[PDB]
Design a protein around this ligand. Structure first.
Ligand SMILES: CC(=O)N[C@H]1[C@@H](OP(=O)(O)OP(=O)(O)OC[C@H]2O[C@@H](n3ccc(=O)[nH]c3=O)[C@H](O)[C@@H]2O)O[C@H](CO)[C@@H](O)[C@@H]1O
Ligand SMILES: CC(=O)N[C@H]1[C@@H](OP(=O)(O)OP(=O)(O)OC[C@H]2O[C@@H](n3ccc(=O)[nH]c3=O)[C@H](O)[C@@H]2O)O[C@H](CO)[C@@H](O)[C@@H]1O
Lengths: 420, 420
C-alpha cells in the first residue's frame, strides 16, 4: 500500500503545468463509443481514472492506446460487446456513461448498477429516466442496468429536475443519434460539459446551448471522428493556486483556461491573495501573508465547485478568523476534516456545514486518504505542517491527479512515495 | 480478500445461541485497565474487535488471553506502558476508551486521536471535555491525545450536552477513581453501560443510576478484580429475529435478555411478527407471512437502536407498503441502501431519511460490505434473494459478529466463505 512521506513547513512557489480536465476526458472517452472513425485526444492526464476507462473501452471492442507522444488514439469502429462489467464499474461509477452511447448507437447496452460510494448517496435515476424519455426500455437484472430500444431513439423535451452533471451528459450523448431534436432544460453548466459537446460537434453532432441550462440537440444518423485537445483542468489549477495560498508562496499555473474558476478565484482574493489571470496562465501570489478566513458554499457551476471544498477547508483551517463551510452537492464529503484535526486543525461539523477556526500552524502526523479529489488537502497540509506527515492510501490521489509528487516537488515540497 | 457466497431463497428457521454484547465486552475490557487483581470474563464473543482490544491491552503490559473454555482471563496488575498506538487505534476508534482509565489510575495516558470514519462525523470532544472537568490536562501532540493529572482526579457535576454512549463510559470509568463524588447528567442509558457499571461495582466501584440519565459515582482509591458474565448482545439477537421476519421463518434466540429490545420487538410486531419473550429466550414466528412496512427513527436507548437500522431497512424493502427510515445518530449510515438497490430493492434517500417501497422479491448479485454492524443486512438479503449473491469485504462483518456463517447455516442458510 503506497503512502506519501511529506516534510516540514515549506513555501510552495514556482511553475506547474496544468493538464486536461479528468472529468472532461472521461465523458469524452465514453462519448467516443459513438465514433465510427478514428479519434485523437491530446492533453489527456495520466491518472488511474483514464486507465480504467480504457480497460472498459477495450472490452467493448474499442482499440485505444496512448502513444509515445502522450496522445490517446482511439478506434471504436468495431464494438462487438455491449456490457461494462461489474468488476470494472465498481471501481469507477462514472462508467455509467457507457450505457447512453451504447444504446444510442447499437440500440442495446448493459452496465453494472453503481453501488455505494463513501462521499454520499449517488443514485443514477436521472440518467435512466432521461434515456427512457428518449425511447429506451430499461430494466435492472442481476445487478445490471439493461437498456434496449427497437429503433433509433427519438428526441423530445427533457427537464432534469435536479442539476446533474452526469445525467446532463448521458442524455446529451444519447441525443446526438436520436431522431429529431432533443431539448435538455435545467442542464448542468460545468465546463467539462461544454468540452464534451464541442468534441461531439467536431464529429458531426449538432449541439448548441452547452454551458447554459438549455441544451438543444439535433439528432444525426451517425458520428464520425476527430482530433480534440481536452479543456484545462480547473480543479487541478485551483488545487495548485491553493498550494501557494496556504503556504504564502507564489505559483504560476501554465496552460489554464481563464474563465472556469471565477468562484474559486474570487474566494482566493477574498482570502487576501493577489491573482493575475492571462489568457493561458493564472498566477497567485500570497505575498507571504496568512490567509483571511472565508465562508464557502458548494453548488453547481458557475458556483463554488465541491471538488475544491476540501482544498479551501485547509485554507480556512490555517487562515485568520472563523468560517462556515456548507456542502450542498455531496452531504458527506467532510472525511478530510477529522484527518486534518489530527494535524492540529480546529473545526466542528453539523449536518452539511462545518465551522472552522483558523490556527497558526499544523503539525505533522499520519493521516488517511479516501477521496480521489478531496484528499489532496491532506498532502497539501503535510507540505505546510511542522515535522513529518504520512498520507496513507494515496492510491485514491492517483485516481484524480497526475504526477502529483513531481508537480508538488517542482514547487518546493519535500514528498516521497514509499510502501511499508 | 474473503467474500461470502450465499444461495437462493430460503426460510430461515431454527435455534441460535446469542453471545455477549460486543459493545459491553469492549468497554469492560478497557475498564479492566483499572483492575489491580485478576479478572475473568465469560460470554465474550469471538470476533475481531475483541482481538484488537487484546492487542492494545497487551502492549500496555496487561497479560490477557482467552483459555480453552472460551473465558477471557486478564491481569492488569503491571501496566508499564501508557500509550494506545496509532497503528492499532486507527482500526477501531473505540480504543479511545483506553485514555480514561489510564489517566485515572496512572495519572497519565496517551491515545491516537481517531480520524475519519465512513458512517459519519465521530469526534470525541465530549470524552476530552469530561475528563478535563475531572481535573485532567489534555493536549493534542503529533496526532496523540495526551492526558496528564498531577494528583488523583476530582469528582464533580458533569452535564454531557449530547447523549453519548462513549463519553458516558469514559467519564464513568475515570470517575471510579476520582476523589469525592461525580454526577453524570444526561448520561446515555444503553444496556452495555449498565453492564460495564455492574462490572466496575464488582471490583469495588460505587456507581448507581446506570441505565438512567443520572449517574452517581463515589470515587475510590483503587479497584480490585472479579469474574463477570457479559450481558447478552441485543443487536445480534435483533439481527437473528430479523432473519426470520424477512424469510417468513421461525427463529428462537437462546440466552437473551428480555428487556433490552423493546423498541425492536415492538416494530417486529408492528410488521406482523409474533414474538414470544421468556426470561432467557426470544422467539419470532413470522407465520410464513410477508412483512408489513413500518417507519423507523433511530435514537438513543431505549429508542430504536441505529445498529438495527439496516436490518430493518431490509425488512422494509421486502415488506408490503411504503416506509420512512430516519437516522438521527449517524447521518451517513445508508451505505447499504444502494447495495440493496442493486439486488432489486427500491428506496430514495434525502438527508437523514430514506423512503422505501417494498418489493416481493430481491435478486442475487454481487454487493460490498463496509459497516461492521449494518452490512449484515447484505448477507441476510443474500439468504432471501433469488439465485446467488456475493458479499465482498466481509472482514467488516467479522468485526461485529461471531461465527456468522455457522449461526446462519444453522438456520437453513446456504452460505460459504471463500476468496478470489
Ligand atoms: C466523473 C465526474 O465527472 N465526476 C464529477 C461529477 O460527479 P456526478 O456525475 O455524480 O455529478 P452530478 O452533478 O450528476 O450529481 C451531484 C448530485 O446529484 C445527485 N444525483 C445525480 C445523478 C442522478 O441521477 N441522481 C441524483 O440524485 C447525486 O447524488 C449528488 O448529490 O460531478 C461532481 C460535482 O461537480 C464532481 O464532484 C465529480 O467528481
Ligand atoms: C464500541 C461501541 O460501543 N460502538 C457503539 C457506540 O458508538 P459511539 O461511542 O460513537 O456512540 P455515541 O453515543 O457516543 O455517539 C453517537 C453520536 O454522538 C456523536 N458524538 C459522540 C461523542 C463525542 O464526544 N462527540 C460527538 O459529537 C457522534 O458523532 C455520533 O453522531 O454507540 C453507537 C450508537 O449506539 C453504536 O452504533 C456503536 O456501534
Amino acid at each position: 500500500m503506497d503512502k506519501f512521506r511529506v516534510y516540514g513547513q515549506s513555501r510552495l512557489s514556482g511553475s506547474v503545468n496544468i493538464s486536461g480536465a479528468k472529468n472532461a476526458a472521461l465523458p469524452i472517452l465514453f462519448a467516443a463509443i459513438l465514433a465510427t472513425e478514428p479519434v485523437k485526444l491530446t492533453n489527456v492526464p495520466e491518472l488511474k481514472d483514464i486507465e480504467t476507462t480504457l480497460k472498459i473501452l477495450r472490452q467493448l471492442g474499442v482499440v485505444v492506446d496512448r502513444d509515445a507522444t502522450g496522445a490517446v488514439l482511439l478506434d471504436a469502429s468495431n464494438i462487438n460487446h455491449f456490457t461494462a462489467p461489474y468488476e470494472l464499474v465498481k471501481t469507477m461509477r462514472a462508467s455509467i456513461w457507457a450505457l447512453a452511447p451504447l444504446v444510442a448507437r447499437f440500440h442495446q447496452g448493459q452496465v453494472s448498477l453503481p453501488g455505494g460510494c463513501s462521499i454520499g448517496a449517488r443514485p443514477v435515476d436521472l440518467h435512466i429516466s432521461g434515456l427512457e424519455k428518449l425511447g429506451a426500455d430499461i430494466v435492472l437484472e442481476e445487478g445490471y442496468v439493461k437498456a434496449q430500444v427497437s429503433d433509433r431513439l427519438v428526441g423530445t423535451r427533457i427537464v432534469i429536475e435536479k442539476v446533474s452533471v452526469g445525467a446532463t451528459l448521458s442524455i446529451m450523448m444519447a441525443a446526438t443519434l436520436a431522431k429529431g431534436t432533443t431539448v435538455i432544460e435545467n442542464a448542468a453548466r460545468e465546463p467539462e460539459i461544454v468540452d464534451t459537446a464541442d468534441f461531439l460537434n467536431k464529429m458531426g453532432a449538432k449541439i448548441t446551448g452547452a454551458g447554459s441550462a438549455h441544451i438543444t440537440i439535433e439528432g444525426v444518423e451517425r458520428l464520425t471522428g476527430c482530433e480534440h485537445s481536452v479543456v484545462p483542468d480547473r480543479i487541478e489549477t485551483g488545487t495548485f493556486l491553493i498550494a501557494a495560498a496556504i503556504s504564502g508562496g507564489c505559483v504560476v499555473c501554465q496552460n489554464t483556461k481563464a474563465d472556469t474558476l471565477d468562484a474559486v478565484i474570487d474566494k482566493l482574493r477574498e482570502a487576501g491573495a493577489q491573482v493575475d489571470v492571462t489568457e493561458n496562465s493564472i498566477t497567485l501570489d500570497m505575498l507571504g501573508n496568512r490567509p483571511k478566513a472565508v465562508n464557502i458554499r458548494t453548488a453547481p457551476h458557475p458556483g463554488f465547485p465541491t471538488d475544491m471544498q476540501a482544498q479551501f477547508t485547509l485554507l480556512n483551517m490555517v487562515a485568520e478568523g472563523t468560517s462556515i463551510i456548507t456542502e450542498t452537492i455531496f452531504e458527506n464529503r467532510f472525511m478530510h476534516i477529522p484527518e486534518l484535526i489530527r494535524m492540529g486543525g480546529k473545526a466542528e461539523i453539523e449536518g452539511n456545514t462545518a465551522v472552522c477556526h483558523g490556527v497558526e500552524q499544523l503539525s505533522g502526523t499520519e493521516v488517511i486518504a479516501t477521496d480521489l479529489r478531496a484528499s489532496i488537502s491532506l498532502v497539501l497540509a503535510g507540505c505546510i505542517a511542522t515535522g513529518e506527515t504520512i498520507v496513507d492510501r494515496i492510491y485514491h490521489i492517483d485516481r484524480g491527479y497526475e504526477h502529483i509528487e513531481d508537480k508538488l516537488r517542482g514547487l518546493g515540497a519535500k514528498i516521497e512515495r514509499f510502501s511499508g
